[PDB]
Design a protein around this ligand. Structure first.
Ligand code: ZN
Ligand code: ZN
Lengths: 327, 316
């Protein structure tokens, strides 16, 4: 006993070759609901990587062992199903995943995926400036984006109101500001977090979204509610370090071109002096980012494939696009 | 020191049939906040003990209390409830008396046995088609069932609109038909669960109820009254016929007459798959599985009862 043969059953048809072992995983919504929060997300992220790689590599099966062996839950759970269904763009998970529970083992069969997207992904990692929601474009939104920028190839930046404060040589602490957070103007306020580290985290999501949608301005050091100019303290940062952190941060952004141009994202960063009252309190950082030729990503797309020789691996930025559409 | 003679006390004769359960916790206060997996385990262990005693004359079940230091005097509501379901009269007081002696706990069980069942059972693995009641027949309903079928020997077969989908030869969505979920038509939809494992799980319970109630049609892959079916990739037509034939085969049947034939059924798989089962009315009784009931004695130990002898305890 304690031994389970891998695909026991009357079925004699051709058995899967690409299989994946996710180790020990707890199943059933009751056990998963009040289990360790950290352990849940690791198993959740583990299965989604496996299922995503199977969808993109010609089908397979996910093998795993049950930590809560004795229950026989016979259902995947809510958190696991919702992440697997979100992977599939048509959300018809019942057509692509089947589960079999065999004693101490649990299988998740995943069928291959090959006006609809060609690959499945945990996150498209590309953002647009949408007032509705700052979530990354889902499979449907992403496919419309890349095909449109490909077919299109076969100022407002300078006249928008945000230019004058982007052209201010000096600002004053506490001054209210005539613009609001629009589709071209984003307000971000500093915390007790170091200035450079907070900029490095905010840059990839917002500079990317601006470049994909008519450009815009990103202001660091302004409250959202109070809409007051406060900036960050002067002492631990200088003008060269803030501009260098931005330049280092923008450079890491991967871009994919549907055209002959290889220009990376063009921007103009400025550090504006904020005065307390005859004393330099600190700085206010504004970044003007121009519209882009094709696509700008906040990072590499989170999407996986799996082969027997190569194992499970992540996809580069550009071939992920070529696997995504018909280039 | 820590030693207990089993039937201490001046006034107790000591019972003959003593069965020993392991370490169990007692008390509604303590049993409420114990490990969930052990609580159900001790329940099925004590309930199995009581059922075997009720059917095997006088007896007593002895157990050692986990929570030694405190002293309860109550089994807990869940143990009382499980024993009530064993006694068809539900008069717990007249058949159970509990005594606590140090770290030991006794449950004295009175022998069992108007027109009432002669044997007690945890659950009869026999199902019938009761509207808003898809539970197995309790002790009295089962006795009323078997006695009705037992007197029948010593003394609708129509084409339901589901016949059209049974002979549909082709499947497509919607296809809602004049028949809805009836007393002879049950709908079951496939989930992300594999097709074989689900059918193997649903067949015994529902095929039993249909065969015992004028027959019927079992539809796999119908939500909503919508047709969904099962995916094509992991399943072949020959497998569905095979798993149904092997699953219905092990369903135990008992005849009150000379017929030894098993229940007649006809399976049919419609493509693009939808599994439909035509099951005919049965001569006597079809069980979903072996009836869950025990007896116990010294030469034999604690043993489960075969399907045949269990029914004969409902005979004269
Ligand atoms: Zn371009
Ligand atoms: Zn018969």
């Amino acid at each position: 006993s304690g031994l389970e043969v891998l695909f026991q059953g009357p079925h004699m048809g051709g058995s899967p070759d690409l299989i994946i072992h996710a180790g020990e995983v707890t199943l059933g919504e009751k056990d998963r609901n009040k289990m360790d929060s950290k352990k849940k997300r690791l198993e959740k992220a583990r299965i989604t990587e496996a299922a995503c790689a199977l969808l993109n590599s010609g089908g397979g099966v996910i093998v795993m062992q049950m930590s809560n062996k004795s229950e026989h839950p016979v259902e995947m759970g809510l958190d696991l199903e919702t992440s697997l269904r979100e992977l599939i763009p048509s959300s018809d998970l019942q057509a692509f995943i089947e589960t079999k529970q065999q004693g101490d083992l649990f299988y998740i069969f995943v069928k291959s995926w090959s006006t609809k997207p060609r690959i499945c992904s945990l996150s498209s990692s590309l953002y647009c400036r949408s007032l509705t929601s700052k979530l990354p474009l889902d499979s449907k939104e992403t496919f419309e984006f890349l095909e449109r920028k490909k077919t299109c190839v076969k100022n407002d930046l300078e006249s928008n109101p945000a230019f004058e404060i982007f052209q201010s040589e000096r600002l004053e602490y506490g001054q209210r500001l005539p613009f609001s957070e629009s589709a071209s103007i984003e307000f971000k306020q500093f915390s007790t977090r170091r200035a450079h580290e907070y900029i490095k985290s905010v840059i990839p999501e917002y500079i990317s979204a601006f470049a994909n949608t008519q450009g815009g301005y990103l202001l660091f050091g302004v409250d959202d509610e109070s809409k007051r100019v406060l900036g960050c303290p002067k002492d631990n940062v200088d003008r060269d370090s803030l501009k260098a952190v931005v330049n280092e941060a923008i450079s890491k952004l991967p871009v994919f071109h549907f055209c002959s141009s290889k220009e990376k994202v063009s921007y103009k960063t400025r550090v504006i002096d904020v005065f307390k009252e005859g004393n330099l309190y600190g700085y206010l950082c504004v970044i003007k980012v121009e519209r882009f030729c094709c696509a700008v990503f906040s990072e590499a797309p989170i999407s996986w494939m799996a082969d027997k020789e190569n194992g499970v691996y992540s996809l580069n930025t550009e071939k992920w696009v070529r696997m995504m559409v018909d280039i």
